[PDB]
């Protein structure tokens, strides 16, 4: 793909983070702590899941960023509406304001309703995410496999400002402690 020139510098918004997350000083990395991180509660924080938003809000244009997922067993990545539900249980679907893919139990799926099986021959260590606001498109690329397409959501109805979306996953297995990292331009 040739989306690299729409690169944006994403940073994580501490105030949205689940209270078990540890965000690095540079706000470019996040990992599961395996305990409460000694922060106050607020209405922005995702309560049920180890999720956080990027600080940046997008309402126009084309945006691209990359995320490192090396050695993780489970994660969700994509974009979401600024107005998504923060408290209680919910599914990742466009109807709920999310445009995501995930890894879970050695398989990759797109967050449609119901979910869609992805076909990945080379397990990715870094994922590229492209958003074209006007076109209603969110696309995912396998940087480890020369930038091959993973999935395209089209006819998206964003219905509001968009924010980068991250889930580091639980670490019940002791095999999923590795961070999500925003990769340099
Ligand atoms: C995501 C965070 O808010 C959360 C949800 N559940 N848990 C732990 C309670 C027992 C082990 C897992 C932590």
From Swiss-Prot:
Localisation: Cytoplasm; Cytoplasmic vesicle, Autophagosome; Nucleus; Cytoplasm, P-body
Expression triggers: Up-regulated by IFN.
PTM annotation, UniProt: Autoubiquitinated; does not lead to its proteasomal degradation. Deubiquitinated by USP4; leading to its stabilization. Autoubiquitinated.
Annotated B30.2/SPRY domain residues: 8-185
Family to which this protein belongs: Belongs to the TRIM/RBCC family.
Domain notes: The coiled-coil is necessary for the cytoplasmic localization. The RING-type zinc finger is necessary for ubiquitination and for the IRF3-driven interferon beta promoter activity. Interacts with SKP2 and CUL1 in a RING finger-independent manner. The RING-type zinc finger is necessary for ubiquitination of NMI.
Function of the molecule: E3 ubiquitin-protein ligase whose activity is dependent on E2 enzymes, UBE2D1, UBE2D2, UBE2E1 and UBE2E2. Forms a ubiquitin ligase complex in cooperation with the E2 UBE2D2 that is used not only for the ubiquitination of USP4 and IKBKB but also for its self-ubiquitination. Component of cullin-RING-based SCF (SKP1-CUL1-F-box protein) E3 ubiquitin-protein ligase complexes such as SCF(SKP2)-like complexes. A TRIM21-containing SCF(SKP2)-like complex is shown to mediate ubiquitination of CDKN1B ('Thr-187' phosphorylated-form), thereby promoting its degradation by the proteasome.
Subunit structure of this chain's protein: Homotrimer. Component of a SCF(SKP2)-like complex containing CUL1, SKP1, TRIM21 and SKP2. Interacts with CALR, CUL1, FBXW11, HSPA5, IKBKB, IRF3, SKP1 and VCP. Interacts with SKP2; the interaction with SKP2 does not depend on an intact F-box domain. Interacts (via N-terminus and C-terminus) with DCP2 (via N-terminus and C-terminus). Interacts (via C-terminus) with IRF8 (via C-terminus). Interacts with ULK1, BECN1 and with ATG8 family members, including GABARAP, GABARAPL1, GABARAPL2 and MAP1LC3C/LC3C. Interacts with TRIM21 and SQSTM1/sequestosome 1. Interacts with IRF3.
Designated name of the protein: E3 ubiquitin-protein ligase TRIM21
Name of the encoding gene: Trim21
């Amino acid at each position: 793909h040739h989306h690299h020139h729409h690169m944006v510098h994403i940073t994580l918004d501490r105030n949205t983070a689940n209270s078990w997350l540890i965000i690095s000083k540079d706000r470019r990395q996040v990992r599961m702590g395996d305990t409460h991180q000694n922060v106050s509660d607020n209405k922005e924080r995702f309560s049920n899941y180890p999720m956080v938003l990027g600080a940046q809000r997008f309402s126009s244009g084309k945006m691209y960023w990359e995320v490192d997922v090396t050695q993780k067993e489970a994660w969700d990545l994509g974009v979401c509406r600024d107005s998504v539900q923060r408290k209680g249980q919910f599914s990742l679907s466009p109807e709920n304001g999310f445009w995501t893919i995930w890894l879970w139990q050695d398989s990759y799926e797109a967050g449609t309703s119901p979910q869609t099986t992805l076909h990945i021959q080379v397990p990715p260590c870094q994922i590229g995410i492209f958003v074209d606001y006007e076109a209603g498109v969110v696309s995912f690329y396998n940087i480890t496999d020369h930038g091959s397409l993973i999935y395209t959501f089209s006819e998206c109805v964003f219905a509001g400002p968009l924010r980068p979306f991250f889930n580091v996953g639980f670490n019940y297995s002791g095999g999923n402690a590795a961070p999500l990292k925003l990769c340099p331009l």
